[PDB]
Design an enzyme around this catalytic site. Structure first.
Site, PDB file in Angstrom:
ATOM      1  N   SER A   8       7.785  -2.492   4.541  1.00  0.00           N
ATOM      2  CA  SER A   8       8.131  -2.435   5.967  1.00  0.00           C
ATOM      3  C   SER A   8       9.581  -1.984   6.126  1.00  0.00           C
ATOM      4  O   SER A   8       9.926  -0.877   5.695  1.00  0.00           O
ATOM      5  CB  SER A   8       7.809  -3.770   6.622  1.00  0.00           C
ATOM      6  OG  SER A   8       6.525  -4.212   6.222  1.00  0.00           O
TER       7      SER A   8
ATOM      8  N   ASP B   2      -1.986   0.449  11.616  1.00  0.00           N
ATOM      9  CA  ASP B   2      -0.574   0.051  11.630  1.00  0.00           C
ATOM     10  C   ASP B   2       0.153   1.032  12.534  1.00  0.00           C
ATOM     11  O   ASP B   2       0.017   2.250  12.377  1.00  0.00           O
ATOM     12  CB  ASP B   2      -0.020   0.092  10.201  1.00  0.00           C
ATOM     13  CG  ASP B   2       1.422  -0.374  10.072  1.00  0.00           C
ATOM     14  OD1 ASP B   2       2.137  -0.586  11.088  1.00  0.00           O
ATOM     15  OD2 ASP B   2       1.873  -0.527   8.901  1.00  0.00           O
TER      16      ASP B   2
ATOM     17  N   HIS C   8      -0.705  -3.633   9.121  1.00  0.00           N
ATOM     18  CA  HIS C   8       0.647  -3.761   8.609  1.00  0.00           C
ATOM     19  C   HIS C   8       0.815  -5.021   7.779  1.00  0.00           C
ATOM     20  O   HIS C   8       0.313  -6.090   8.129  1.00  0.00           O
ATOM     21  CB  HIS C   8       1.605  -3.844   9.793  1.00  0.00           C
ATOM     22  CG  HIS C   8       3.029  -3.826   9.393  1.00  0.00           C
ATOM     23  ND1 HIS C   8       3.650  -2.702   8.908  1.00  0.00           N
ATOM     24  CD2 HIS C   8       3.950  -4.817   9.365  1.00  0.00           C
ATOM     25  CE1 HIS C   8       4.917  -2.996   8.629  1.00  0.00           C
ATOM     26  NE2 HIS C   8       5.114  -4.273   8.887  1.00  0.00           N
TER      27      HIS C   8
END
Lengths: 328, 330
Positions: free
Chosen positions: A171, A268, A298
């Site tokens: 991320s 995502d 995600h």
């Protein structure tokens, strides 16, 4: 004899739209039936959501140690994770955690880190960078780079060959991978064998097709992303800086980037910017692999409730296998 | 100060997720699409076979051990090629290997580099099955041969140094179709047990109208007209095409329940992409542990074509398939 049965009614039968797998859907169903949106929380409240959700997971065997380094009038805490029966000197990867700069720490990410260490055979070096909004850009990416330089130059002190060094992160940690690699290119080192960008953030923009398609209901929302970026830096110039929005780098700015693996999640908001960044890397001559894992949200490889999802176990084994090959 | 440099113009940016080939794949397509020969579907089977033979000939092979065995099943002989890691000695788990080529094309030499890569990355023995091509044979001859050879390895693997109780199924394209066909026969016939399936850019349905079929219908090596020709040489029967051993995408949830744990790889720029991903979703809805990975920038048969064997994505994709297989064959 067999052919008669094979052509018979025994085997008669009677749009590739993105949908979560059943295991991911079960996770989302409970989450979406719950309360207060994260962007209305204080940093402390938001941090506790992830802490409480990750707490108590079964951790696969590994050896964990700690070292605090002093660099340029700054103390940086490292957590070092090695395979359970490690012997001798190992190659290593830096590990940059996710959490939108506001959330995350080592315990929340420990299961993921241990999975990557086990699958790669390499030591992980987690960097305890300062969260936002306590710090803004570029404090954490500077800490990440200085820690990377320290491992490259002093890694023997933690039993690692700093000349065989990867960069891994999920991320905003995948953003941090790119940010450290771009600093290393500008500053003429250290050499990096391989980058693994797990479902990365690559641009301070909120209008890609995947941002619109997965805007709400898929764990990470568009409004969470805006909140995370606002806590990190509200400066338009910072957001136009390649160390924050690496998707905005030109081909010439990306030439020479380390060999890279990008994993993206099909459902995502960040999917499209991660895949687009991979295309830009390839256009700049960078060896790059981009793998989309279908049915995933995600942070599929972070969230401990999803740690037994079949795709998660395979994806993390696969990331580790690629890392192993590039750290030899 | 260090911060001062990081926020400075040194790092200011100087500079839509549309499917495009990688640079290396585009270079290959430009060579391929430069040729002025006729479309493959206008060739004889022999002429078409020679296209793939020549594309694959002369490639550097990574180290491995290769041997051969002909087995006798139900009066018919089936030739096997067995591939093991270079320093193999000791019993190994195994995977059956079902080659691609639209049933008309392909053989062991064309697929040898790919097979060796998977053996090296997984540590397992590969058992290639020399099934009868089409149109010499039609459905279901080859899938029967594949099933009988799988059963033979499960029961007699000691003869080739394999633990047949730890057995996977691997194949590319129509070979990935063959993986599903063998798994569905094994379910119907109560064995043998299968640890793991790897379906590499598979064919799953005798239909030509998915979005990816339309988007990539020409120019990406495998064409829509090639796929129609391959299916036509395999079987023109509507009933056969509605049979789950030919079009496994048409299986119901109940028909897919109990399918082995599976990895599907798809190529972003492949007519077959959507049917492969859709099959994975159906497996998951039937409770099957399944992973579906799309490799961006790739064409059909990215991991087969020897001119692409140094493409970064290819090397990683095959390492990753092998790692998944290793984990499931322990």
């Amino acid at each position: 004899t067999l052919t008669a049965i094979l052509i018979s009614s025994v085997f008669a039968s009677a749009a590739n739209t993105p949908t979560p797998t059943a295991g991911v859907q079960a996770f989302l169903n409970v989450l979406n039936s719950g309360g207060k949106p994260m962007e209305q929380m204080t940093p402390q409240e938001a941090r506790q959501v992830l802490i409480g959700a990750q707490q108590g997971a079964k951790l696969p065997p590994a050896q964990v140690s700690e070292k605090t380094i002093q660099v340029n009038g700054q103390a940086i805490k490292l957590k070092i994770v090695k395979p359970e029966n490690a012997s001798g000197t190992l190659p290593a990867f830096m590990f940059f955690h996710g959490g939108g700069w506001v959330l995350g720490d080592f315990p929340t990410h420990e299961r993921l880190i241990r999975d990557l260490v086990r699958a790669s055979g390499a030591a992980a070096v987690y960097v305890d960078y300062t969260p936002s909004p306590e710090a803004h850009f570029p404090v954490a990416i500077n800490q990440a780079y200085e820690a990377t330089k320290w491992v490259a130059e002093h890694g023997q002190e933690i039993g690692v060959d700093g000349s065989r060094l990867g960069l891994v992160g999920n991320s905003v940690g995948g953003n941090m991978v790119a940010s450290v690699a771009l600093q290393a290119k500008q500053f003429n080192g250290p050499k990096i064998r391989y980058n693994v960008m797990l479902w990365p953030v690559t641009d301070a923009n909120f209008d890609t097709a995947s941002y619109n398609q997965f805007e709400n209901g898929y764990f990470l929302s568009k409004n969470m992303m805006k909140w995370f970026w606002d806590n990190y830096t509200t400066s338009a110039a910072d957001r136009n800086n390649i160390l924050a929005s690496p998707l905005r780098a030109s081909t010439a700015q990306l030439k020479g980037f380390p060999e890279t693996l990008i994993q993206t999640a099909e459902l995502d908001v960040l999917r499209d910017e991660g895949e687009a960044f991979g295309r830009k890397l390839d256009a700049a001559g960078v060896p790059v692999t981009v793998t989309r894992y279908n049915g995933m949200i995600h942070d599929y490889g972070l969230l401990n409730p999803l740690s037994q999802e079949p795709t998660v176990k395979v994806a993390l084994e696969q990331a580790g296998a690629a890392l192993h090959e590039h750290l030899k």
